[PDB]
């Protein structure tokens, strides 16, 4: 257990096989739910 400093990684590493006569198509799906927050008002004074 200690403190370590480093250089971050931008993200994962991926490559896609590209060909002049190839294609891919999905077969199953999924339903997802997300949440977002937004402020509206603020307090009145005198």
């Amino acid at each position: 257990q200690s403190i370590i400093a480093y250089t971050m990684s931008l993200g994962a590493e991926n490559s896609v096989a590209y060909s002049n006569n190839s294609i891919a198509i999905p077969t199953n799906f999924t339903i997802s739910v997300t949440t977002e927050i937004l402020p509206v008002s603020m307090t009145k004074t005198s």
């Binding site: 931008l10 993200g11 590493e13 490559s15 590209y18 002049n20 891919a24």
Partner: protein, 179 residues
Amino acid sequence: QVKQIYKTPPIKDFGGFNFSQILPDPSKPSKRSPIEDLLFNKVTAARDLICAQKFNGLTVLPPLLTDEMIAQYTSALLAGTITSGWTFGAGPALQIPFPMQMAYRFNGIGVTQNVLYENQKLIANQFNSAIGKIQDSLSSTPSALGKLQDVVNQNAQALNTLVKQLSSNFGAISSVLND
């Protein structure tokens, strides 16, 4: 914006579109496109302004993200949009031929795909010519990048006025206080 990082295949054939003027160049250490290098060049013993403003109570901090990482992000986005179309924007990426994607976009705008299928060489020639022309144009015109210059000039002017304000008497005997 994106979670993964994509890479172009080593072979650079896409049915007749050169695309060389925008892809990263492995030779240059900055791994930047010629357009990017032109933009960077176009946009621009003694004490530097940094230390000069330093030694009066003003400091400049460095940003968090660096140009290499920014270029990496840009290249990843470009490779993804070239290889997979819009599919990777809402889930896993799926490969598809470039003329096929062009036909889909032409159907989307509202013209039947045979028109594209029978004019491929002409379309490619026009595309390459347009890329060359825009390269020449942004190389030539020197007055198309005002806004960033104005931002820098405003910041510099504000700092210069602030530092120059120190020498005013404000109605007293002398500005210097030790005297």
